[PDB]
Symmetry: D2
């Protein structure tokens, strides 16, 4: 079992660091890596809104700054600690680093990433 309480808690803590002067919408994420460490991320607004960095992308950056590996589970929350589903961009980028079986926290029942992004674009297409 994944310690979802621990991941959700770490995601919430991460959200406190969000840089959101324009969106005012803090987001945090935390992921369990296959070596057992946890990496975290928060969103980062830009004045050109289309250059905004998602919390889940920040998690992926942290993954490869701290030794690499594969993601096993991820929780994403807003500033109030409510669980959020990743945006489509983040689903694709998370898939690169945890695949279809990466588990994504959900208010009712955590979901396989493969269910959140079925028939995904990928290597087979290139």
């Amino acid at each position: 079992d994944v310690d979802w309480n621990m991941l959700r808690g770490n995601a919430t803590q991460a959200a406190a660091g969000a840089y959101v002067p324009y969106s005012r919408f803090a987001v945090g994420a935390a992921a369990l890596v296959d070596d057992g460490r946890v990496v975290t991320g928060c969103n980062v607004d830009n004045v050109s809104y289309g250059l905004t960095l998602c919390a889940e992308c920040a998690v992926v950056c942290a993954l490869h700054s701290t030794g690499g590996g594969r993601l096993l589970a991820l929780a994403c929350v807003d500033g109030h600690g409510s669980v959020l589903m990743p945006c489509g961009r983040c689903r694709q980028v998370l898939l690169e680093h945890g695949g279809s079986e990466l588990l994504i926290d959900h208010p009712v029942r955590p979901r396989r990433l493969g269910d959140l992004l079925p028939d995904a674009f990928g290597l087979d297409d290139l």
Copy 2:
């Protein structure tokens, strides 16, 4: 009721315009708008690869340059005319402009975008 042969054909034609010096992976897309017009897009490489524009995003730019509206159906194909599933980013972008019932071409049977991006991040989360 959607002429998929027509949409797929226009997507194929669109792919011929692809700017792909670095990726060498041409993609074209075409979508039926709710006023009955068809809009098209192709991918555009950048030397900083993360600034690459997807065909499906190009379709959405075209949508709003030609009078706006809602997308009803989209086909995306590679340089060989083979049907591609949109990347996660494009699934999120297309959802904004066609919603869950937007149909996405597929080699077997076209799919609702809602099935390709379930429990999507959205307005309720902000």
Copy 3:
């Protein structure tokens, strides 16, 4: 000489099509292509703000949907017709399609893109 009045006017018209329910910040752009046609673009918000498409990127999509070519001059304006400098992302993407000598409209004196993005990242680095 570039007909800046004409480009600025076309950029302003393009801004009217902006999809900006979240940012409320309409942007339009228009560019002269080296075959003499003008292509236009507007910005497109997404609920995931980081998937927002810039007007200038939309111009580049239009370029390669309408026969390709090179950009000679570009004007970008807000919803009030005031001239805007492109964001850094757009400077890089415009550079791919017009190079250092692409002229960018400015309230006082249009500027070479090479001056707006000096010592640019590019092919030499790859």
Copy 4:
């Protein structure tokens, strides 16, 4: 007053973490924060190339995961340790967090970000 040898070295070390199966172009970056700590980042390819994360953006994610603050100096290098100029997107992102006086390493003499992104798009435009 900035130890460029130290920053360049940490950037080089950061590049070793790069996730670059598709681009094969490793990039690392390191920045001095105004509390005196150093944060690092590396690039991260995605199979949809337009979702690639730049090293410099990874630095900004790290900044806000480690207490926030302002960037004073940044070095960016390739896999061979050669100094790279940031792409336009990254120039805009870095400007948000270090402003015009943020120093950017360069093979000849480090440059003010204000000189690398003059007349930048910003808060005044919104």
